[PDB]
């Protein structure tokens, strides 16, 4: 249950590079 | 969305890879 | 002036500042801005990075985890107004977890028209107390400035002028406070109020062409109060003509733009339909219109949820595919989603669609354009649609099919008559060629009864209905296999027995009317009933046979059932609320509930038992009777009743009172009223009769009206000197001794109180009765 | 808020 | 000999017991509210000697004693009992005494006497003379052969009394059996043990069997029996038990016919749906073999075949359906099959075949039934409808054949032969059918491919499936989709039900890895198989790794209040847990968090195809004396009495040591306090006190760890200079 | 007779016309 | 209930026989 | 729930006359 | 039979009229 | 034990009327 | 293109043979 | 899309075969 600001680094560890787009 | 999947419930990377590109 | 640069849309610049360079010539963000999750940006990336051309943002700003970013005084020094045209949960500004962000520095921030400011978890963020948001916000109440460097007090928030506080944004930029007459229009450098359509700042005071930004609206280098015609109020900050909205609508040929309320709007407001000439949102002609442009111009409908997406559709720019094969609420949810549709650009597919029977629940569906054709140039498809008996009421539903043909195959319950009806109504009649329509797989198992069967006599009993009807005979009457009466229960009119053929044998005057009696029926019940012929498919042009009409026959207002639950509660010594339910088979409009009641007298053996004996274990409880026709009421309180007397009650229900009362069978119940209190309390005097031998005979009037009856009497005698000794008086003991009789007792004064004991309980002690027998010495 | 924060960011 | 009787509410029917000497049965005179003792003064039947089953009396009014009605009744056999009573006398109003002075022996049963409000002389009766077991009696609310008047014992086949002693022809009744004026021990042949009291020949049993042509009598075990015992079939010649219409609309309608074999009648069938169809129906009804009458099947909806009539090999057709049919089929919609006519053979003796409006049964089954039934030349015009039956089954006379099969794990490419009708316009499609089938106890439409050519054209239509659970057997078959011809219709093909398994592929996450550290070195990791096990999972690929303690914990001053402490390629130590879904792991440090990875392998030797990882993390238990302090407590007291303390640390702790605690108290003072952190111990090399009070102190020292407290050291004794 | 035909089983008029004259 | 069953059988046979009439024996 | 001898007198109440046969 | 209908459960007369003739 | 005997007599009278009344 | 045909919707080989040569 | 496109080349390897296929996966 990854919550709060811990999810941000849980995401950016999964993201790493470019991450998330807007098309 | 991701809070309903990864925060209220538990995600894997595979549920988080949906939140990749 | 007012806006030298371009107008740029809303943007979300993500993870790198290369896309921030697309804000080069931008003076208005027509939208919002969200620069977020820049873990890789450094303050070197922000030293040579600035866009002072930006003057206004329409919606909001959001910042989230942009590293390296330290102040916004470099990136956007001349940003003045966020309109708050869209809000981010009532925030026109969310600054959240901005690492490295030390100050806002936005010294040209003057007025937020709509929304609030969320500042949270910005661990370095100072100069938050130096900003007068009340100058900037018309309502600072919904703001959220918490968890910053400003809260846990370490911020050296020094304004350039090194509770009432001076106002700044940096160490080198104050907060420009205009006079109060410069309300939201702001002031120039000497403090002169700007134009009343400026908002916050102006290059030259009192000039709508020398505003920096507009208070309400903008048109042609000038802050306008409104968009005058022909200019439409474009995005609530500017004024554009028809051709602009028109050509962007044609570029979206995306929010194809329309027009209403002097505004180039994306979509028409409620009840309104665009007028394709001039984009005018004209009122529709109830439900609202809904053009459902489909993905890939097609959609398979296989379930109710597949229709819930198409709920409310009217015109379909595409085709549809149908393979719903079963489920609850079929054709009803499907009408509620789908009868609303009127027009289809493309074709229509129905394949393998099992459990439904008709398409009449497409109530408004009056156009197939067939613009998308099924292969073979079909605008229509029907395959393997098994239980389908009907396309539409072609006497009711009219339908246009513009292009294409009709694929009618393996759909074995839809007759050809509906097909030729569809040929005529659809206007596609001369289109269909060989094997567009299968003749031998479609309606071949529906038997298409072109004639009617007619009932010759109907007799109903209450559970039984004799039908008589005309014997049908095919011209080769060998083929008559049977007769197939169908029925069910129907209290509305919102709508099986096989019978053999009768004896042909003759026709001078032969009642070879086959007749039918039904049997197990709930009486007084409407029954939708219809017969069908059973014959043989001919080797020739088949005789289609007949079927009778759905007749709605009610069984008979007959003796109804037992009126349920007769609950008899004796809520007084003369009141008993008998309440009950209707009969399970009410079997008619129950006129009255026929209540019979009867008083049950007390038991005879109770009058002749010696209740002075230990073993006195007492239970503490034609001819016309008093009756009641309880018309239209299923309860009854009954008055005029004795106290403490068991009664027997009979309930019936009548749905028939005046001609020869047809009433229910009896519902019996039995109950006893409450006792009275002073029914058992003893009336009349306590008489002592003392003999010469002091055989003392007691007398008393009995409780004449008891609670039912009196089982025994109790007498309390005690001397000044003695204690209460005891002796009992039963019914026969009272009736024989005419009271009581004591024999020979002790000198000194006794006193007598007398209790009645009843079936209900004890009737109170009499008064203490004083007497002395002869002492014979004194 | 922070429930609604990441639901709008991550695709 | 008179049967068992129940004389009710009046004594007129009691006069039918006029000439009766044996009640072959029981007697029950009951509920005679209208009888009076005047009715019983002129009422007697002394001819009755024996009752075989029992007696029952209930609310016969006026009846006062039984010494008049039956003075010479002697034996109730108890051949049938009334809840182990050969006698129930219940609520006999006016009955004052029994008076049955000739009652001598009840062979079987007991006596129930209850609520007989006037009944006396109940203690005067020795029931132990009468009953061999008086224990089950209910009286509340010359062994058995008996004697004559002088007391001489009767014959040993007499029972209770005899007119002349020691004579089986001068018995009053028989002990066991009776034959021809004589109490016999057994029924000798040819006499059969008739009703367990007498002996009758074949012709008696025979002719009563023919009168019941009722319990048509049969023969077994030297007995004229009504019905044969278990496993036995009567032999119609000699009755010898030799070893072996109705509408059916529902399962319960078959539960009555459960176990039937030969039906002397016809059957009507309109079952239209329900659970366990054809299976309960076989279990009730496959057992049937023979039918005298016809067979009706009308409107019978949801079933598809009659193969579940496994033994049904005879229709006599003795009852004919009208039109002289022994068979009927109407409106039987989903029926695709009569029987496997290669398997099920069936005789239809009389009658014809009514085949109408049954649109899924092909004519081929019909002509099979014509040939097998022997009814082929019987059926005339319109006995059988040609155009309403099997006309919607398409009767694919050919087979479709698969030309190539590729499976991925979730995906199966099929290739197969393009079928073409001779008028290939009519090919409407191809209709692949499939489902899941782990047994072999057993839908997609595909368009036609491009005809266009045939030099060497792969116009093999191909098909890939997609969403599949990998490693799963799939019963799959194609059908052609064509048009019904206006001519003799081309019946088309359909492919065989092929049972293709998807691929032993990477299986799913092995479910619920529960890691319980049941020791300081043992952790039972247990788990479930993956939800998609996707193959015979060879081993469960367990990876584990020790996670060291966090670095910031070594450099925090835990003497500060705010010391809120949590009381908790490269090859790793791994395990291929073959055929086991649990694992305890040994050789582990005490009190150290570990990271564990679980996979499942259904493939180990060629190029291990294993599951995706299942991670779990856990810490072992602490040791007890890992935290307890080793080494001596050294005091070093300066000239200025700046006392430096030294001690060896707990070298192997439960993980690490966060702080140290020292207890010092004078004889005179109390324990005062001062803390020693990690860096305070590492820098001061122990502790250092500065300048305290005279009088003797004592020092015990505790370790405090992540796991808890490591015990106090020994009290350490020293004195600083008092200087006076 | 008629009870075995029209009561235990079901009659038509034709089974009841046998119970006419 | 044969009584109820036979109750219509006279109403049956009066409709069935009509002017012909019917001999009807209900009891046992 | 007519039980014991209560159902017996309930039967003779419902039957009255002849009551129950044996064929 | 009658005990399973009129004693364990509750009968009417109609369930008891089955226990008539 | 006395309620094993109670139910016993009662089994009967259960079985009493089930065999009598048709 | 192919994602709008074979991924968002469902392709046959024939919709994929367009993505051949 | 990543799983979805991953088979498309397995599909298009069977669909095209010796023809081969051009496959752009990105966005």
Distance CA C643, CA C626 (A): 17
- Does residue E21 lie within any of the structural domains? yes
Optimal mutation site among G9, G12, G19, interface C, most CBs of chain C within 10 A = G12
Query: Across-strand partners of C595?
Result: C628, C651
Sign of the Cα pseudo-torsion (E643, E649, E650, E656, in order): positive
Do the Cβ atoms of K20 and L4 come within 8 Å?
no
C-alpha distance from residue E237 to each of E195, E209, E218, E232 (Å): 22, 11, 10, 15
Provide the 10 A C-beta neighbour count for residue E403.
14
Contact of L5 with chain K, judged by CB distance below 8 Å, is answered with yes
Give me the CATH number covering residue C629: 2.60.40.10
Structure tokens given for E623:
């040791």
- Does residue C37 lie within any of the structural domains? yes
- Does residue C591 lie within any of the structural domains? yes
Same structural domain, E17 and E53: yes
Distance CA C402, CA C368 (A): 6
Do the Cβ atoms of H7 and I7 come within 8 Å?
yes
- Using DSSP bridges, classify how beta strands E242-243 and E633-636 pair: parallel, antiparallel or unpaired: unpaired
Is the Cβ–Cβ distance between C201 and C193 less than 8 Å?
Answer: no
Q: At what angle do helices A6-15 and D2-9 cross, to 10 degrees?
A: 10
Report the residue of chain F nearest C468, measured CA to CA. Answer: F13
Burial class (CB in 10 A: 0-12, 13-18, 19+), C373: middle
| Entry field: residues in chain H | 23
Unique residue bearing structure tokens 């070893």: E243
Query: Across-strand partners of E594?
Result: E546, E618
Show the beta-strand stretches assigned E in C523-626: 526-534, 546-548, 551-554, 567-569, 576-579, 592-599
Contact of G2 with chain F, judged by CB distance below 8 Å, is answered with yes
Is the Cβ–Cβ distance between C355 and C329 less than 8 Å?
Answer: no
Who contacts C641 (Cβ-Cβ below 8 Å, separation ≥6)? C573, C574, C575, C576, C599, C647, C673
Distance CA C238, CA C747 (A): 124
Nearest to E250 by CA among E317, E300, E203: E300
Structure tokens given for C257:
């733009």
Q: How far is H8 from chain J (nearest CA, A)?
A: 9
Q: Using a threshold of 3 CB pairs under 8 A, tell whether chains A and K touch.
A: no
Of F1, F7, F20, the CB nearest to G16: F20
- Does residue E179 lie within any of the structural domains? no
- Burial per residue of E94-113, b for 16 or more beta-carbon CB atoms within 10 angstroms, e otherwise: bbebbbbebbbbbbbbbbbb
Q: Residue F14: phi, psi to the nearest 5?
A: -70, -30
Is the Cβ–Cβ distance between E434 and E475 less than 8 Å?
Answer: yes
Q: Give, in degrees to the nearest 5, the angle at Cα A18 between A12 and A23.
A: 115
Who contacts C546 (Cβ-Cβ below 8 Å, separation ≥6)? C449, C450, C451, C452, C453, C472, C532, C533
Helix ranges, chain F (H): 2, 13-17
Distance CA G2, CA G6 (A): 5
- Burial per residue of E305-338, b for 16 or more beta-carbon CB atoms within 10 angstroms, e otherwise: bbebbeebebbbbbbbbeeebbbbbbbbbbbbbb
Q: Using a threshold of 3 CB pairs under 8 A, tell whether chains B and G touch.
A: no
Is the Cβ–Cβ distance between C240 and C263 less than 8 Å?
Answer: no
Is the Cβ–Cβ distance between E85 and E110 less than 8 Å?
Answer: yes
Do the Cβ atoms of B3 and D7 come within 8 Å?
yes
Name the DSSP class of E595.
E
Q: Which of C446, C461, C488 is the last residue of a domain?
A: C446
Contact of E83 with chain J, judged by CB distance below 8 Å, is answered with yes
Distance CA C530, CA C375 (A): 42
Same structural domain, E651 and E524: no
Nearest to C485 by CA among C473, C471, C472, C498: C498
Is the Cβ–Cβ distance between I2 and I8 less than 8 Å?
Answer: no
| Entry field: residues in chain A | 23
Structure tokens given for C56:
């206004």
- Burial per residue of D1-10, b for 16 or more beta-carbon CB atoms within 10 angstroms, e otherwise: ebeebbeebb
Name the DSSP class of E520.
S
Structure tokens given for C663:
């009433």
Structure tokens given for E182:
């004589």
- Provide, as residue numbers in chain K, all residues whose Cβ is less than 8 Å from the Cβ of E464: 13
Same structural domain, E13 and E112: yes
Q: How far is C487 from chain G (nearest CA, A)?
A: 21
Secondary structure class of C711 (helix, strand, coil): strand
Report the residue of chain J nearest H22, measured CA to CA. Answer: J22
Distance CA C773, CA C743 (A): 11
Q: How far is J4 from chain I (nearest CA, A)?
A: 19
Name the DSSP class of I4.
I
- Provide, as residue numbers in chain G, all residues whose Cβ is less than 8 Å from the Cβ of F13: 12, 15-16
- Does residue E98 lie within any of the structural domains? yes
Q: How far is K21 from chain L (nearest CA, A)?
A: 6
Structure tokens given for E714:
């020994």
Distance CA L16, CA C391 (A): 43
Secondary structure class of E168 (helix, strand, coil): coil
- Burial per residue of F1-20, b for 16 or more beta-carbon CB atoms within 10 angstroms, e otherwise: ebbeebbeeebbbeebbebe
Nearest to H13 by CA among C669, I11, C652: I11
Same structural domain, E12 and E127: yes
Secondary structure class of E255 (helix, strand, coil): helix
Q: Residue C333: phi, psi to the nearest 5?
A: -60, -35
Nearest to C264 by CA among C282, C284, C289, C281: C281
Is the Cβ–Cβ distance between E102 and E73 less than 8 Å?
Answer: yes
Do the Cβ atoms of E31 and H12 come within 8 Å?
yes
Distance CA K15, CA G10 (A): 77
Resolution, expressed in angstroms to one decimal = 4.5
- Does residue E468 lie within any of the structural domains? yes
Provide the 10 A C-beta neighbour count for residue E36.
13
- Provide, as residue numbers in chain K, all residues whose Cβ is less than 8 Å from the Cβ of C295: 8-9
Q: How far is C473 from chain G (nearest CA, A)?
A: 22
Name the DSSP class of L4.
H
Same structural domain, E427 and E471: yes
- Does residue C712 lie within any of the structural domains? yes
**Total domain count for chain E?**
5
Radius of gyration of chain A (CA): 10
Give me the CATH number covering residue C352: 3.80.20.20
- Burial per residue of E48-57, b for 16 or more beta-carbon CB atoms within 10 angstroms, e otherwise: bbbbbbbbbb
Is the Cβ–Cβ distance between E107 and E80 less than 8 Å?
Answer: no
Nearest to C636 by CA among C596, C672, C673: C596
Same structural domain, C531 and C614: no
Q: Which of E213, E243, E273 is the last residue of a domain?
A: E243
- Provide, as residue numbers in chain J, all residues whose Cβ is less than 8 Å from the Cβ of E138: 9
Do the Cβ atoms of E391 and C444 come within 8 Å?
yes
Is the Cβ–Cβ distance between E266 and E291 less than 8 Å?
Answer: yes
Is the Cβ–Cβ distance between C27 and C53 less than 8 Å?
Answer: yes
- Provide, as residue numbers in chain H, all residues whose Cβ is less than 8 Å from the Cβ of I7: 1-3, 7
**Total domain count for chain L?**
1
Structure tokens given for I16:
């008891």
C-alpha distance from residue E405 to each of E398, E419, G2 (Å): 20, 17, 70
Do the Cβ atoms of D11 and A8 come within 8 Å?
no
Nearest to E537 by CA among E527, E547, E545: E527
Give me the CATH number covering residue C251: 2.10.220.10
Report the residue of chain E nearest H12, measured CA to CA. Answer: E31
- Does residue E481 lie within any of the structural domains? yes
Q: Residue G8: phi, psi to the nearest 5?
A: -90, -20
Is the Cβ–Cβ distance between E675 and E661 less than 8 Å?
Answer: yes
Same structural domain, C319 and C442: yes
- Provide, as residue numbers in chain J, all residues whose Cβ is less than 8 Å from the Cβ of I4: 18
Q: Give, in degrees to the nearest 5, the angle at Cα F8 between F4 and F11.
A: 80
Distance CA E157, CA E143 (A): 11
Distance CA C651, CA C668 (A): 6
Report the residue of chain I nearest H4, measured CA to CA. Answer: I7
Write out the residue range of the structural domain in which residue C492 sits.
451-554
Q: Which of E454, E473, E501 is the last residue of a domain?
A: E501
Q: How far is H20 from chain J (nearest CA, A)?
A: 6
């Amino acid at each position: 249950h990854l919550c709060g600001s811990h999810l941000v680094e849980a995401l950016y560890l999964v993201c790493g590079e470019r991450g998330f787009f807007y098309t | 969305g991701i809070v309903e999947q990864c925060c209220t419930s538990i995600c894997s990377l595979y549920q988080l890879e949906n939140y990749c590109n | 002036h007012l806006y030298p640069g371009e107008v740029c849309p809303g943007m979300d610049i993500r993870n790198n500042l290369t896309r921030l360079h697309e804000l080069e010539n931008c003076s208005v963000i027509e939208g919002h801005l969200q620069i977020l999750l820049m873990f890789k940006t450094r303050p070197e990336d922000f030293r040579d990075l600035s866009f002072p051309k930006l003057i206004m943002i329409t919606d909001y700003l959001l910042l989230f985890r942009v590293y390296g970013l330290e102040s916004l005084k470099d990136l956007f020094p001349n940003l003045t107004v966020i309109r708050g045209s869209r809000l981010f949960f009532n925030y026109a500004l969310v600054i959240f977890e901005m690492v490295h962000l030390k100050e806002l520095g936005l010294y040209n921030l003057m007025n937020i028209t709509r929304g609030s400011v969320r500042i949270e978890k910005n661990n370095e963020l100072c100069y938050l107390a130096t900003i007068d948001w009340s100058r900037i916000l018309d309502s600072v109440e919904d703001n959220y400035i918490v968890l910053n460097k400003d809260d846990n007090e370490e911020c050296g928030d020094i304004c350039p002028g090194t509770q009432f506080v001076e106002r700044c944004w940096t160490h080198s930029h104050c907060q420009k406070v205009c006079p109060t007459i410069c309300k939201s229009h702001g002031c120039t450098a000497e403090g002169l109020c700007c134009h009343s359509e400026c908002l916050g700042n102006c290059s030259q005071p009192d000039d709508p062409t020398k505003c920096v930004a507009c208070r309400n609206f903008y048109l042609d280098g000038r802050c306008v109060e409104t968009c005058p015609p022909p200019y439409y109020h474009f995005q609530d900050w500017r004024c554009v003509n028809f051709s602009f909205c028109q050509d962007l609508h044609h570029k979206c040929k995306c929010h194809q733009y329309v027009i209403h309320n002097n505004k180039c709007i994306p979509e028409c407001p409620s009840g309104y339909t665009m007028n394709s000439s001039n984009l005018l949102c004209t009122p529709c002609l109830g439900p609202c219109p809904k053009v459902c442009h489909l993905l890939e111009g097609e959609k398979t409908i296989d379930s109710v949820t597949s229709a819930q997406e198409l709920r409310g559709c009217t015109v379909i720019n595409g085709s549809l595919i149908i393979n719903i094969r079963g489920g609850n609420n079929l054709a009803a949810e499907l009408e509620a989603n789908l009868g609303l549709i009127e027009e289809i650009s493309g074709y229509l597919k129905i394949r393998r669609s099992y459990a439904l029977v008709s398409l009449s629940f497409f109530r408004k569906l009056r156009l197939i354009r067939g613009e998308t054709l099924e292969i073979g140039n079909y605008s229509f498809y029907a395959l393997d649609n098994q239980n389908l008996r009907q396309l539409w009421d072609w006497s009711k539903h009219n339908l246009t099919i513009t292009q294409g043909k009709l694929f009618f195959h393996y759909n074995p319950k839809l007759c050809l008559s509906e097909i030729h009806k569809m040929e005529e109504v659809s206007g596609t009649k001369g289109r269909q060629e060989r094997n567009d329509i299968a003749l031998k797989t479609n309606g071949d198992q529906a038997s298409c009864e072109n004639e009617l069967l007619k009932f010759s006599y109907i007799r109903t009993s209450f559970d039984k209905i004799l039908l008589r009807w005309e014997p049908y005979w095919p011209p080769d009457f060998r083929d008559l296999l049977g007769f197939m009466l169908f029925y069910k229960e129907a209290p509305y009119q919102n709508v099986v027995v096989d019978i053999d053929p009768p004896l042909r044998s003759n026709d001078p005057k032969s009642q070879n009317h086959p007749g039918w009696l039904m049997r197990g029926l709930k009486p007084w019940t409407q029954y939708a009933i219809f017969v069908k012929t059973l014959v043989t498919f001919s080797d020739e042009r088949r005789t289609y046979g007949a079927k009778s009409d759905i007749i709605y026959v009610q069984t008979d207002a007959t003796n109804p059932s037992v009126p349920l639950d007769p609950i008899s509660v004796s809520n007084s010594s003369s009141q008993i609320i008998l309440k009950w339910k209707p009969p399970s088979d009410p079997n008619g409009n129950i006129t009255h509930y026929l209540v019979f009641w009867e008083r049950q007298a007390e038991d005879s053996e109770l009058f002749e038992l010696d209740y002075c004996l230990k073993g006195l274990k007492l239970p503490s409880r034609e001819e016309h009777r008093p009756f009641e026709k309880v018309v239209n009421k299923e309860s009854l309180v009954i008055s005029g009743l004795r106290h403490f007397t068991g009664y027997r009650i009979e309930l019936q229900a009548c749905n028939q009172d005046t001609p020869e009362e047809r009433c229910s069978v009896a519902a019996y119940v039995s109950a006893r009223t409450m006792p009275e209190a002073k029914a058992d309390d003893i009336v009349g005097p306590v008489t002592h009769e003392i003999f010469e031998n002091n055989v003392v005979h007691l007398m008393w009037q009995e409780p004449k009206e008891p609670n039912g009856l009196i089982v025994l009497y109790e007498v309390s005698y005690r001397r000044y000197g003695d204690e209460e000794l005891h002796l009992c008086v039963s019914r026969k003991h009272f009736a024989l001794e005419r009271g009581c009789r004591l024999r020979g007792l002790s000198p000194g004064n006794y006193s007598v109180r007398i209790r009645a004991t009843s079936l209900a309980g004890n009737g109170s002690w009499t008064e203490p009765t004083y007497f002395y027998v002869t002492d014979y010495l004194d | 808020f922070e429930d609604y924060l990441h639901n709008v960011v991550f695709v």
